[PDB]
Amino acid sequence: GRKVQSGNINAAKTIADIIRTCLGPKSMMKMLLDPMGGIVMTNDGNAILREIQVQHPAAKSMIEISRTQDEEVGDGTTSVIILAGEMLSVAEHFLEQQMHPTVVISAYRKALDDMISTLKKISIPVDISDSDMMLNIINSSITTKAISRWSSLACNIALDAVKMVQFEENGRKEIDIKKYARVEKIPGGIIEDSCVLRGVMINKDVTHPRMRRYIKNPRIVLLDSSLEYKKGESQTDIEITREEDFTRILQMEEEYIQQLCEDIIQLKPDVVITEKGISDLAQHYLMRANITAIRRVRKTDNNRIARACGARIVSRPEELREDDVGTGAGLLEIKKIGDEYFTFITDCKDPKACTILLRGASKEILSEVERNLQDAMQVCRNVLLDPQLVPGGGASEMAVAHALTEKSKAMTGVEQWPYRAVAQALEVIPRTLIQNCGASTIRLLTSLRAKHTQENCETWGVNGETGTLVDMKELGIWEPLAVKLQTYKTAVETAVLLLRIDDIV
Amino acid sequence: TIRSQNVMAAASIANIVKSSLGPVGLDKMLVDDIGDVTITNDGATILKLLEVEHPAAKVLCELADLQDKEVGDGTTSVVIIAAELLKNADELVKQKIHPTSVISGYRLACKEAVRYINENLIVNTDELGRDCLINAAKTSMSSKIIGINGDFFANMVVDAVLAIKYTDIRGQPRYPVNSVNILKAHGRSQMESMLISGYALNCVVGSQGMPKRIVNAKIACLDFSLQKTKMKLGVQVVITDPEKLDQIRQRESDITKERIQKILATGANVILTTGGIDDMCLKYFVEAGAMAVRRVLKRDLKRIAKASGATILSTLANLEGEETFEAAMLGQAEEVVQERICDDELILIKNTKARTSASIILRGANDFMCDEMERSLHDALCVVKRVLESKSVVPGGGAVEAALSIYLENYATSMGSREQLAIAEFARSLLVIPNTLAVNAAQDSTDLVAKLRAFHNEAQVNPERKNLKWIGLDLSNGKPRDNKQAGVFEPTIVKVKSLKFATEAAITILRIDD
Amino acid sequence: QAALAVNISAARGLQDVLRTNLGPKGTMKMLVSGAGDIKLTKDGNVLLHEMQIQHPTASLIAKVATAQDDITGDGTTSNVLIIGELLKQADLYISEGLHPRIITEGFEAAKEKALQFLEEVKVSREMDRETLIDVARTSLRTKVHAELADVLTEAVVDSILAIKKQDEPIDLFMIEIMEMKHKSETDTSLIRGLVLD
Amino acid sequence: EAVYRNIQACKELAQTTRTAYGPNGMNKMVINHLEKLFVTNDAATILRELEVQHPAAKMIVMASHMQEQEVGDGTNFVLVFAGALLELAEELLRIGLSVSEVIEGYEIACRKAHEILPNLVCCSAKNLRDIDEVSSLLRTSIMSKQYGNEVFLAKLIAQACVSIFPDSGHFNVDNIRVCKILGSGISSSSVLHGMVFKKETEGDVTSVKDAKIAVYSCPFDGMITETKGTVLIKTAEELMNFSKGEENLMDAQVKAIADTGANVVVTGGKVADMALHYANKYNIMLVRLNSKWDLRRLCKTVGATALPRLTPPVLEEMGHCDSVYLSEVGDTQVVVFKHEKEDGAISTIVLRGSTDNLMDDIERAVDDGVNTFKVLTRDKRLVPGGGATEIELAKQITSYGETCPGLEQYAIKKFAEAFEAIPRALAENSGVKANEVISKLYAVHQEGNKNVGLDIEAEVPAVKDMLEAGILDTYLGKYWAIKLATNAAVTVLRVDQIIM
Numbered sequence A: 001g002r003k004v005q006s007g008n009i010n011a012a013k014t015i016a017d018i019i020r021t022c023l024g025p026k027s028m029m030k031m032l033l034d035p036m037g038g039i040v041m042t043n044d045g046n047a048i049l050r051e052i053q054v055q056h057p058a059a060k061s062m063i064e065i066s067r068t069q070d071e072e073v074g075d076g077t078t079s080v081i082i083l084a085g086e087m088l089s090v091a092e093h094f095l096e097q098q099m100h101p102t103v104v105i106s107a108y109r110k111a112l113d114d115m116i117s118t119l120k121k122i123s124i125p126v127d128i129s130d131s132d133m134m135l136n137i138i139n140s141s142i143t144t145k146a147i148s149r150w151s152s153l154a155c156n157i158a159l160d161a162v163k164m165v166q167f168e169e170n171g172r173k174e175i176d177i178k179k180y181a182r183v184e185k186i187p188g189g190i191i192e193d194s195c196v197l198r199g200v201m202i203n204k205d206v207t208h209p210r211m212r213r214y215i216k217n218p219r220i221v222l223l224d225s226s227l228e229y230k231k232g233e234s235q236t237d238i239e240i241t242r243e244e245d246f247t248r249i250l251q252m253e254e255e256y257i258q259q260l261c262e263d264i265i266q267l268k269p270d271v272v273i274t275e276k277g278i279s280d281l282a283q284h285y286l287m288r289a290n291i292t293a294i295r296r297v298r299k300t301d302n303n304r305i306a307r308a309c310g311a312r313i314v315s316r317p318e319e320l321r322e323d324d325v326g327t328g329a330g331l332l333e334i335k336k337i338g339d340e341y342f343t344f345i346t347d348c349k350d351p352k353a354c355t356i357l358l359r360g361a362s363k364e365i366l367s368e369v370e371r372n373l374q375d376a377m378q379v380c381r382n383v384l385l386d387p388q389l390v391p392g393g394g395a396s397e398m399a400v401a402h403a404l405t406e407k408s409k410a411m412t413g414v415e416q417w418p419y420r421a422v423a424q425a426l427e428v429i430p431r432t433l434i435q436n437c438g439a440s441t442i443r444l445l446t447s448l449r450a451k452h453t454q455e456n457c458e459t460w461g462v463n464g465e466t467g468t469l470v471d472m473k474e475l476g477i478w479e480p481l482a483v484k485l486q487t488y489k490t491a492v493e494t495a496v497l498l499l500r501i502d503d504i505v
Numbered sequence B: 001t002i003r004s005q006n007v008m009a010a011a012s013i014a015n016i017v018k019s020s021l022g023p024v025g026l027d028k029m030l031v032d033d034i035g036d037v038t039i040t041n042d043g044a045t046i047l048k049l050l051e052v053e054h055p056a057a058k059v060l061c062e063l064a065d066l067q068d069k070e071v072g073d074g075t076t077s078v079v080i081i082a083a084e085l086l087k088n089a090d091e092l093v094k095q096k097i098h099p100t101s102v103i104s105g106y107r108l109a110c111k112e113a114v115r116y117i118n119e120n121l122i123v124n125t126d127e128l129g130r131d132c133l134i135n136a137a138k139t140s141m142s143s144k145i146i147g148i149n150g151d152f153f154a155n156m157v158v159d160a161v162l163a164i165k166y167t168d169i170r171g172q173p174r175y176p177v178n179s180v181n182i183l184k185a186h187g188r189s190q191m192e193s194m195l196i197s198g199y200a201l202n203c204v205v206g207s208q209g210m211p212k213r214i215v216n217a218k219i220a221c222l223d224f225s226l227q228k229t230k231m232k233l234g235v236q237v238v239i240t241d242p243e244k245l246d247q248i249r250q251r252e253s254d255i256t257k258e259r260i261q262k263i264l265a266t267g268a269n270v271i272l273t274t275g276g277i278d279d280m281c282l283k284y285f286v287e288a289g290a291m292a293v294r295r296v297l298k299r300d301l302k303r304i305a306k307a308s309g310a311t312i313l314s315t316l317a318n319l320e321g322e323e324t325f326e327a328a329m330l331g332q333a334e335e336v337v338q339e340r341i342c343d344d345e346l347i348l349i350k351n352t353k354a355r356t357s358a359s360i361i362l363r364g365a366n367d368f369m370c371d372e373m374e375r376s377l378h379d380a381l382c383v384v385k386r387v388l389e390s391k392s393v394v395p396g397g398g399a400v401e402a403a404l405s406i407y408l409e410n411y412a413t414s415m416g417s418r419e420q421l422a423i424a425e426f427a428r429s430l431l432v433i434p435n436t437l438a439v440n441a442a443q444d445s446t447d448l449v450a451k452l453r454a455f456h457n458e459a460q461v462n463p464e465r466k467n468l469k470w471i472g473l474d475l476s477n478g479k480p481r482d483n484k485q486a487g488v489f490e491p492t493i494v495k496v497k498s499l500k501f502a503t504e505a506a507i508t509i510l511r512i513d514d
Numbered sequence C: 001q002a003a004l005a006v007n008i009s010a011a012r013g014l015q016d017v018l019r020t021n022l023g024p025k026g027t028m029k030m031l032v033s034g035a036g037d038i039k040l041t042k043d044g045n046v047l048l049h050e051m052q053i054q055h056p057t058a059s060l061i062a063k064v065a066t067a068q069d070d071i072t073g074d075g076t077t078s079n080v081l082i083i084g085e086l087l088k089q090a091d092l093y094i095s096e097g098l099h100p101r102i103i104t105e106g107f108e109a110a111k112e113k114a115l116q117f118l119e120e121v122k123v124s125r126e127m128d129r130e131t132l133i134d135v136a137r138t139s140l141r142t143k144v145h146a147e148l149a150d151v152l153t154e155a156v157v158d159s160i161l162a163i164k165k166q167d168e169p170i171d172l173f174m175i176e177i178m179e180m181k182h183k184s185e186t187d188t189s190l191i192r193g194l195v196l197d
Numbered sequence D: 001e002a003v004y005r006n007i008q009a010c011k012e013l014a015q016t017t018r019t020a021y022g023p024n025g026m027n028k029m030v031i032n033h034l035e036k037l038f039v040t041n042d043a044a045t046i047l048r049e050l051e052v053q054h055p056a057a058k059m060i061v062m063a064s065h066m067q068e069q070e071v072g073d074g075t076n077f078v079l080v081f082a083g084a085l086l087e088l089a090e091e092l093l094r095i096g097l098s099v100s101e102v103i104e105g106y107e108i109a110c111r112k113a114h115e116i117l118p119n120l121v122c123c124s125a126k127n128l129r130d131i132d133e134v135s136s137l138l139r140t141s142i143m144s145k146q147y148g149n150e151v152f153l154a155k156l157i158a159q160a161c162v163s164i165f166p167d168s169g170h171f172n173v174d175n176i177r178v179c180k181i182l183g184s185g186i187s188s189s190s191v192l193h194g195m196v197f198k199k200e201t202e203g204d205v206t207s208v209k210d211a212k213i214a215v216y217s218c219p220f221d222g223m224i225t226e227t228k229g230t231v232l233i234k235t236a237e238e239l240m241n242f243s244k245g246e247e248n249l250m251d252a253q254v255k256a257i258a259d260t261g262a263n264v265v266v267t268g269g270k271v272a273d274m275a276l277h278y279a280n281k282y283n284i285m286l287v288r289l290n291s292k293w294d295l296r297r298l299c300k301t302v303g304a305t306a307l308p309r310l311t312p313p314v315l316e317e318m319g320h321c322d323s324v325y326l327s328e329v330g331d332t333q334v335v336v337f338k339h340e341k342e343d344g345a346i347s348t349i350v351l352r353g354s355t356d357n358l359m360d361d362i363e364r365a366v367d368d369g370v371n372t373f374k375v376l377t378r379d380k381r382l383v384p385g386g387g388a389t390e391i392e393l394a395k396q397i398t399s400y401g402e403t404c405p406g407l408e409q410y411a412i413k414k415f416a417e418a419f420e421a422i423p424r425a426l427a428e429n430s431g432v433k434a435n436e437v438i439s440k441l442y443a444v445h446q447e448g449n450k451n452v453g454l455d456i457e458a459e460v461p462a463v464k465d466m467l468e469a470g471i472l473d474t475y476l477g478k479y480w481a482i483k484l485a486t487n488a489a490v491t492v493l494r495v496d497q498i499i500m
C-alpha cells in the first residue's frame, strides 16, 4: 500500500480515537492540558475539535469539514469523525494488503447511495402540523443532549420560534441557517419567566431615558419625498489638526444630520434607518417625535430588521403608502427591565430577524437555547420536505449495515469487499455507545445485529442512558432525517477526500 | 553525476503529478502557504501552485507552464512524458551513450512523431462523418454521473452546437461554451431538457401590456430602467440646503417615466431592465407600473445582445439612457413566443437572425441532481467545444502514444546510427501516458499497455485492420475501447505541441551536463 | 488505554498532601510564598491554593474542590479524601478490566441513597447556646491549637447570636474581624458594635 | 502478547509454504545437513529440511506428518489452511473474542464442513483398474507436484498401480517403489513388475524363474593386506587362499541350492573377476552394490534373513520373489525380482532422470501419486478440487454464520474466510491478482454451477468448470485434511504460553 495514504489513515484513526468514546448521551470525559497553565474538562466533542488543532496531516481536511458541519448543523455532528475514522481504518485493511486506491472510492460511493436509500426506508413518519407529536419527539431529542429541567420550557419557545421561522423562502421553502436566528443575552431576573418572543430585540433604541415607546404602525421615512441627502458631509471633508477642531468638524456634519433629524421629528415615523450615524443631541429632541434612529447598520441589518418590520415607507405620519412586506411587524413591545430598556418588535408569518425572550442568572442556560433551536431548525427543515425521521442513536446503524450487507451478498466484483467493509465500519457508533456504557461490546453488538437480522426489526438498538439492547422505538428518543443523512454524506465525502490523497507537497 | 541528480529531481516532480493524470486521477496535497492546504487534482493548478527548490524541476515546470499557457491543457502530460524520457535518457547515459546522442535521437523522434501523427492517425474535422455517434459516445463518457438518460444529451448537443458559428480569422467553426446559456431549473420528470434554439428568460407577468406574450414579427434590443429609490443623483451634498436633494430624485423618476414612454411608443416588445434596481424599487414598480424584468443575468444580457446583432452601447453611452435611443436596437428575431413551458413562465425566442446564440432550460426534479445535471452539461459542452474548435483531432487516450511507440521502435530498428537506441527508447518511454492512465484506472498497467501494443502492432503491420489503429484507454474499463464507437478524443494540435514541448524540455534539461 | 491511571495517581498524591490534616489532633501545613514569608494553615481551602500543585489534573481537582466548597466551607478537606478513596477503589476495580462509567453510575446511586439516609442522620433542635458552642468548638478545634480554640469559640457563638432575628446568612457587614499585632492573645473576644481601623 | 507471539510462528510457516502450494507454485531450494543443495516443490520435504524451533511451527509440522500417515495427498493444504485459520483467529482476538468461543465456533463449523463436504461430491472413481479414469485421477496430484509432466507420469502410475490391485479389498503402498537411472530422459521412464535395480550383477544372465534368493547384506568384503610388523607383508598366500575360499564357498553354494534354491544373491561388498568366472561356471548372479535403504527394503520384502556373512546359503533365508529376471529397458540393464502370484505383487517404476535434483522431486511426485491412488482405493468418491471445494465450503459456512445467531458467528465467518484463503494463495502462486479472481469465482458460485474453479494457466483472472477439465480431488483426503488442520489449529490456539 501507498505509505503516505496509510499515514493519512493513521492520522484519521488518531483523531477518531480522540473523540470516539466522547459520543452519545453517556459520553466519556476528555482532558486538555494547556502548557501555560489551566485545564479544561469537556465531553462535548466539538469543543475538543476546535481546541485540538496541533494536527498537521491532511486531517486538516477532516477538521475543516467537521467545523463546516458544526456551523451548518452542529448538534451531534461529532459522530462524523468517528464514522470517517472507522471507515478509513477498514479501508486500510484492503489498501495496504493489495493496492487499489480507486475501486475503494467506487465502493464508498455505492455505500453512500445505498445508505441514503435505506435511511429513506427504515425511518418512521412524523407530522409537522399537530403539537401532540412533534412536541414529544423534539422534547426527547433536545433532552438527550444537556437538559434536565428546562426541557419543557426551552423546547416550546425554540420550536415556536422555528414555526414562525417556517415559510421564509417562499420559493425553495428553506429557512435561514443563521442569518435570522440570532439571540440576545438578556441578563438576570426570574429565570422561569423566560417565555416566547415571536419577534426580535431592537438593541440601541432606549439607552437614553426618553427614546420611543409603543408605536403600532411601523412607519419609516427616507430621502425620497420629505428627506434629503443634504444632511451628510454638506460643507467640507473632515480635516485632522487637533482634537478640539476634529470634534468641531465632526459635530458640523453631526449637526446637519441633527437638522434633518429635527425635520424627521415632524414626520413622526415609528423607526428610521441610517447607515452612517446619528446624533444623540438630536435624539434628545424626540419626545413629540416618539421616533427612534438606528444607525451604522450593515446590509444584513437593513435587510432583516427592515423586512422583520415590514416597515411603512411613508412620507408623512398620517398616511400609508408603501410597506416593505405588508404589516409585517404586528406589534412592538418595550419591557421596563434593564438599564437599556429591552425593545421587542413582533412580526407574523414572515421571514425576520429572530431573538427569544430569555432570563437567567447564569449564561449556560442562555447559551443552550440557540443550540437547541438549531436542532429544532434541522427537524423542521427536514420534516417540511420529508415528513420523515430516523431512529438514530446508534440503533439505525445496525439496520443500515444489515441492509447494506444483504445488498452486497448479491453484488459481484472486487468492490464487494470494501462495500461490506463500510457496512461493518458503520457499526462503530453503536459499538462506541456500548463500549461507553461498559457493557460487553462484542456480545451486545452480536445480539443487536442478530436481532436486526430478524424481520421488521429495523428500529432495534441500544439505549445509551442504560447500556442495554432494548428497542429504540416507543422509547421516545430519535434523530432527524436531515442530520443523519448529512452525517453520512459528510462522513463518506471526507473518506473519499482523504483516500483520494496519495501524496503531499 | 549532477545530471543524474537533475534526473532524480525531475523523476520526483513527475511522480508528484503522475497520480493526477486523467479524469479519474487522484487528488494531491500541496502547501504553498502554512495558512491553508489546497485540494486539487488539476494538473495545471498543482504544477502552478507547487514549486520545487531544485533547478531542474524549475526548468521542467517552467516549460510545462509555457505549454499550458500557450496551447492550453496538457501540462501534466508534458511533465510526465518529458521526465520519463529524461530518466530513460539517463539510463542510456549509464550505457555510455553520450547526452548529445540522445538529444539528436529525441529531436529525430519528435520530427517523426510530428510527421506520423499528422499523416496516418487523424480526422479531417468531419469526425469521419460519425459526429452524431462520437458525440453520443462522448456524452456518455464526458458525463458518467448522468447514466441512463444518455443519448438525448448527444442529440441536443450535436445540433445546438452546430447551430453556433463564431466569426474569427478566416471564420473557423469554433463554437464557444458561452454560445449556449445554461438555465438551472428543477421540478419535473427527469426525462428531458428543452434546448432553446435561441435564448430564454423570464419577465413580469400581468404587466405585459405588450405583444411579447404572442408571436412578434420584429423585436428590439433595448435596455430598461425604472427607479424611485435614489438611483440617479444629479446634484450632490456639497451644500446643506435642507429641502434641496429630494426634487431632483423624484424628477429623475418622472423623466425616466418619460423615457419609457418614449420607448413604449416605439414598442418592439424586447425590453430588459439593467442592474442597480433596489429591492424597494422592485416592490414599488410591480404596482406603480413597470415594463421591467427581475434584473436577469447581465452575462445573459451581453450574450443576448450579441445574439441579436445589436448592443445598446452602439446607440447609447450607458446602460440606463437619457438621450433618445436610435433605431439601431431594432431587433430581428424571427419568432418570440411566451409559453407556460416546462411548468414555468419563461419567454421563448427562436434563432435570432444575424449573430446568434443557443440556450437550454432544465426539466429537472430536485435541486441537487439538477445541479449535477448543470455540471454535466457544462462538461459536455466544453469538451465538445474542445473537439470541434480543435478543427483537427487525434485519437485520445493511450491510442496515439502506443501507436507512436510501436512506430518509433520500428523506425529505430530501421535508422542505424549512434542514436539508434535513442529513438527506440524514446518510444518505450513514451508509453508512460498509457501506463499512468492504466494505473490511475485501478487496472494493471502491464496488461492494458500490453493490449495497446498488441492492437497497434496488428493494426500497422497488417493493413487489413486499419480501424484497429484507434483503440486507447483513459478511464476504468475491463477492455480497451475503440475510438470510433467510443469518443474519447484530444485535439491533435495540442497533443502534438505538448509532445514537442516535452521533447524540447528533455533536450534542454539533458544539455545541462556539469 | 488506561490513561486514567495517571489521574488516579494524581488524586492519590493530592490525597496524601491533604492527608494528616483532619481533626484537632491532625497536623497543619505551611505555605512558603515566593516572597519567602511564612503561612501556617490547616484548612484545605487555602491548601488547594498552594500554587505548587506540581501536576495539572491535581490543579483541576484543587480548583474544583475550592469552587464546590466555597458554598459551605466546613467540608473542603474531607472532600479530597473521599474522592481519593473513590478513585482508589476505582483503580482496584479497573485493574480487572471493568469500565469506569458503570462505577460512576454506582457512585451516583450510592449518593442517592446516602443523601436520603443523611436526611435521617441529622438531628433537629432549637439552637440553644450550649449546642451552638459545642458545634463551634468542634468546627474550630480542627484548625487551631486546642488550648486557644475555646476563647475564640465563645466569641464566635456570641457573634452568631447577635444576628438571630432573621434567617439571613453570614455577612461581613455585621461581623468584621479586626486584627493587630500584640505580645499575647489574651482573650481575643469580640466587641459589640464596630471597631475602627 | 504471548498468544500472538505463538500465532506468529504459524503465520510465518504459512507464508513460507504458501508459495509452494499446488501447480505453478514457487520452487524452493533446501539445504541438507551436509550442505547438499536441491530444489523441491513438496512442502513436506520443505518442513523436513526447514528446522522449526518455535513450538507452534512444530505443532503444524506434526499435523502435516499425521497427514502423511493418513493420506499423503493434501499435506500442504493442512499447513496453509491452518495458517490462514490462525490469521483469522488473530483477527478475532484483536477484535476481542475470547479464545474459548473462537474454538467452539471453529469446532462446530468444522463439524458441519465435514458433514456437508460429501454433499459437494460431484462423482466418484466408478471404474478402477481401467487406465482411462485412473490416469486422469492421478493427473491432479502429478500437476500438484510437477506441472511439466501431467499425463505421462499419470498414465505410468495408472498402469503400475492397477497391477497391484487384484485383492479388491486393499493393497500396501510399499508395493510400488522407485529405482534410479541417472543421466537419462524423463520421458524414457517405464513401468516394470517387481523390484528392479540398475547396478550391475556378476555372472551371466540366467534368470531362473524359481531362484529362491540367498539374502545377505554384505557377504563379501574389500581389499586388505596384512603387515608383518609396521611394514607390509611379502607373500601372496593371503590372496591365493582367499580366492580358493571364495571358490569353495560358492561350491558349497551350488551344494546348498538343495535347501536354499538360490540362483541369485545380493551384496554390498566388492567381488572380483574371480567371482565372475566362478559364478559363470556355477550359473549364479550376484548384485555387487546396493544402497543401505535398498538393501534394507529388499530384506523386509523378501521376508528372509539378511546378514553380512561370508557363508554359503542357509535354510533360514527362503526367497520371496523366487522368479528373478533381468531387463535392459531405457538403454540401461536392470536386474529384476518378481513373483507371479497376485497377492503382494510388488512393482516398480524405472525412473529415468538426467538430474538427481529433479530426480528426487519426481520421486516426491510419484510418492504423492501412489498416496492419492491409495486414497481412491479406500474411498472412490471425488471432490472438485482446485479452489472450487474451498469456495463452496466457504459459502456454506458463511450461510450458516448469517443464519446462526450467537457469539460464535464471527468464528464461523472467519472459518469461511480461512477456506477462502486457499484459492487466493493458489492465485498468488499462479501469478494472478487474488482479490479479483476470488470475487469472480465467489460470484459464479452464488448460482448454478457448484464445482467451477479458477483457471491457473490464464493470465486474466479466469474461472473454469472443474469436471470438464478433469483435475478433481479426493473426498477422503480433503475430509481428513480439514479435520487435522482444524484440530491442529485449535490445539495451537488453545495454548496461552509456552514454558521452558
Ligand SMILES: Nc1ncnc2c1ncn2[C@@H]1O[C@H](COP(=O)(O)OP(=O)(O)O)[C@@H](O)[C@H]1O
Binding pocket: D021, D022, D023, D042, D043, D072, D073, D074, D075, D076, D077, D140, D141, D143, D144, D145, D368, D385, D386, D387, D453, D454, D455, D456, D471, D472, D473
Ligand atoms: N491444473 C490445476 N488447476 C487448478 N488447481 C489445481 C490444478 N492442479 C492441482 N490443483 C489443485 O491444487 C491443490 C494443491 O494442493 P497440494 O498442496 O499441492 O497437495 P500436496 O502437496 O499434498 O501434493 C491440489 O489439492 C489440487 O487440487
